[PDB]
């Protein structure tokens, strides 16, 4: 569902 380059941290 996500872009692998998207924010991988808590948000």
């Amino acid at each position, epitope marked *: 569902n*996500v*872009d*692998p*380059n*998207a*924010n*991988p*941290n*808590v*948000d």
Partner: antibody
Amino acid sequence: QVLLVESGGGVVQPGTSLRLSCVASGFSFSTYGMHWVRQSPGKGLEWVAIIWYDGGNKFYADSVQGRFTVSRDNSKNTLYLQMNSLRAEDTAVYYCAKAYRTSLDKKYGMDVWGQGTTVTVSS
Amino acid sequence: DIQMTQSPSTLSASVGDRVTITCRASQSIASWLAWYQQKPGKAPKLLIYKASSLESGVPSRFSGSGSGTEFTLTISSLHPDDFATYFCQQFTSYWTFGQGTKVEIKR
């Protein structure tokens, strides 16, 4: 100060399994995505895997897809790389790296890497 | 599938020289470009993030520029600690690196 300590590398034969660890300190490990990156003379710098802060989303490089799995245990502050069906072309120094801090950006790289652990695959 | 290629592969220069390294992306990556420094036996170290932003502790003599497919790393005055290999990295579509540019001492 961010500190990443890889471990588990060694000299093994092809077709075997090996599991690398990366222990983190100096920052909130459970709130950051983490990367695995390897480097060899033949292939250069190769991104291997990424895992989301909570251990959910995982993405892998094509060259390791189906053979390597990435995981993490936030209670132990450790990042793992399970390698299976090792081949000689998997020989490299494997680094662990922390994703860049959260901002308004939609794309994210890495900032701090560990010292590296060497995996030698040979018959 | 985004290939990063640097030039030159080896650059010979003296202390105090102004040197420039170029990085080229096979397709557009906007400004999602990082510059790394590595000395033998040591892990790569991030110097520049998002094309032009120096990281904390990096001396002002380093700087980067570029957007799209053409990128440049520049050292205004070469310092004895700057002789190393430099890698570029795109972080828009997975993560891929250039092959490196060794900055070597010219005697």
